[PDB]
């Protein structure tokens, strides 16, 4: 409603870097808000794409940002009569970034890994990896929970159980308020998808450079399955956290599985032991239900609500014809110990191929009326197909069915404006929460400042 669409702020990275593929707000120890920006195709040392991370100080003018430096060198360790190998070429560092406390977590979901033992090998596969930084101190750490040293022949002899070689850890990411990093790994367990959680403090305290294979004993991984409903489900394509079981001492996870059950799609709510509490099934096959998930209380009853994006939902139209426009589903959490019911509200895009629902960002309370609000992205929506971000305001019965404000992409065609969103943070300290919108196609981020209504 009250986002300023006139005076924007633009940050930019190198060309072809996909600057703005992922973003997040970051507060330093003094509470000063910055913008961490992932650029997963930034050139590395050998003039080869490896990705990169930028930490943008808040300036109304915007401009260029300094890099958040990470080790981009391939690693080799000869230990235990084996050879450990990391491969950072085209690893996509910055395909996801997330900030918690004074720590930044930037992940390379396509970092490859291999283990050589004489003539055999584990196979060169994208286990993924995440990089952690404490910018004020310079502390660095890594976390790659799917790295293993099992040779390929063993996986064959054991029928490919507990096969984490293609995890792509850090594909999606989120950190609990207690400081527990939760990684989405959609390729884990032979493309079923898994989750990897470990306290940030323990990641730092157990990491040492050059080890490549180390234990984080406090970590917790989800489980393999023989149920074909989960095969190729990409469990962990998106992840989020929230409170859904009434016990404030436990944190519940929200996992998107957009191809669950033969591409029907699903979203599951689980406890910290990965025990399933709720499952929301997709409405339409191939709609990619669960591509994005958001958790925020929109109707002001103190109970976290769930939002699910299905950006490829095909709406029915006259003469038995379908039109892909995307759809967003709102699930209000019922009072007390009960199951999430049917969707409370359906938001459906209008622009063909607009992919409405590709990203859903909680905004906090934008207009300061007492109800939290959201922004939904249609990265190829709008009458020109350049992309649109639509704001929906919360209300006592959930959400408004019509947007309060629409942000048309300021970038050229193909910028994917809205592919990444982040709100609920006041960056200019005016008392109003603001919205940052990534447009990796144009290698830029736009900042929308909220103003008095």
């Amino acid at each position, epitope marked *: 409603l009250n986002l300023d669409p006139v005076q924007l702020t633009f940050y930019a990275g190198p060309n072809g870097s996909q600057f703005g593929f992922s973003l997040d707000f970051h507060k330093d120890s003094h509470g000063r808000v910055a913008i961490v920006v992932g650029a997963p195709r930034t050139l590395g040392p050998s003039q080869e794409e490896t990705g990169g991370v930028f930490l943008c100080p808040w300036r109304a003018e915007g401009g260029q940002c300094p890099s958040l430096l990470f080790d981009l060198r391939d690693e080799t360790r*000869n230990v235990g009569s084996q050879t450990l190998q990391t491969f950072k070429a085209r690893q996509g560092l910055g395909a996801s970034v997330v900030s918690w406390s004074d720590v930044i977590v930037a992940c390379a979901p396509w970092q490859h890994w291999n283990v050589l033992e004489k003539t055999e090998e584990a196979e060169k596969t994208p286990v993924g990896s995440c990089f952690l930084a404490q910018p004020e101190s310079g502390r660095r750490a890594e976390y790659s929970p799917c790295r293993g040293n099992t040779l390929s022949r063993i996986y064959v002899e054991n029928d490919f159980s507990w096969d984490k070689r293609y995890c792509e850890a850090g594909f999606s990411s989120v950190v609990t308020q207690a400081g527990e990093l939760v990684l989405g790994a959609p390729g884990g367990y032979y493309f079923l998808g898994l989750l990897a959680q470990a306290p940030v403090a323990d990641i730092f305290s157990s990491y040492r450079p050059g080890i490549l294979l*180390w*234990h984080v004993s406090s970590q917790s991984l989800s489980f393999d399955s023989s149920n074909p409903e989960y095969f190729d489900g990409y469990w962990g394509y998106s992840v989020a956290v929230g409170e859904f079981d009434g016990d404030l001492n436990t944190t519940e996870y929200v996992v998107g599985a957009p191809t669950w059950s033969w591409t029907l799609g699903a979203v599951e709510i689980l406890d910290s032991y990965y025990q399933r509490l709720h499952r929301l099934r997709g409405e339409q096959m191939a709609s990619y239900f669960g591509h994005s998930v958001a958790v925020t209380d929109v109707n002001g009853d103190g109970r976290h609500d769930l939002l699910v994006g299905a950006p490829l939902y095909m709406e029915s139209r006259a003469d038995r014809k379908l039109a892909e426009v995307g759809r967003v589903y709102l699930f209000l959490q019922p009072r007390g110990p009960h199951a999430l019911g049917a969707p409370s509200l359906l938001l459906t895009g209008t622009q063909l191929y607009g992919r409405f629902g590709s990203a859903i960002a909680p905004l906090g309370d934008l207009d300061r009326d007492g109800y939290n609000d959201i922004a939904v992205a249609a990265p190829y929506g709008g009458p020109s197909g350049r992309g649109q971000v639509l704001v929906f305001l919360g209300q006592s019965e959930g959400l408004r069915s019509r947007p309060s404000q629409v942000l048309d992409s300021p970038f050229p065609t193909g910028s994917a404006f809205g592919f990444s969103l982040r709100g609920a943070v006041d960056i200019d300290d005016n008392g109003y929460p603001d919205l940052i919108v990534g447009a990796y196609g144009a290698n830029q981020v736009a900042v929308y400042r909220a103003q008095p209504v």
Partner: antibody
Amino acid sequence: EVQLQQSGAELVKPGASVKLSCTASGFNIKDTYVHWVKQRPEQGLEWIGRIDPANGYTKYDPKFQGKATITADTSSNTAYLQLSSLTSEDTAVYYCVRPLYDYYAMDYWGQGTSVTVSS
Amino acid sequence: DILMTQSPSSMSVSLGDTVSITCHASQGISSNIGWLQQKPGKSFMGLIYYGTNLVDGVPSRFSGSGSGADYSLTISSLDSEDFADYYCVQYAQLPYTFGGGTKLEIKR
């Protein structure tokens, strides 16, 4: 806290067999490798082998191939070292070892099980 | 197998001294070495892993160094508890192999 609590001292006859135990305390035995190390005053420390309790895959020094058999039961959170066809030279102290962080390290040690072979 | 020649077999020193134990391997092990401590009549305690990294709970007066096939464990300012046996172990190759050992004894 990580603690490896081994079995009591064993007193056996030559030619017999003995099964030493190493129980995980404060952690899951399935977490890391579990090794076995033999110690003698003259010969010193000797690596016997290792097991991955998660799957039961083992490695051995070819010296102990035949006498030493390493197993593990995740249920009881315990690793085992079996010694067959005992000899006076098998009289030694035996330790179970696991790493702290580095997958291949040798950092945490049980108190040690004394073994004495005699008729 | 990789032979680990640890030197010296023993040393007579006093409190506060700065001593260094060396360990030589028959081939390059690229910092894949650990240092161990065995107090008299007791079990073992991990000191160093991967050449230079301290085990959790170990005082900083301990430190590991070296490269290739030559490594060193240094104890700055000896404490009354530091008088014990010390061993180096390589895990660059299987089978793991240990050094002969080093006993720190009180000088008088």
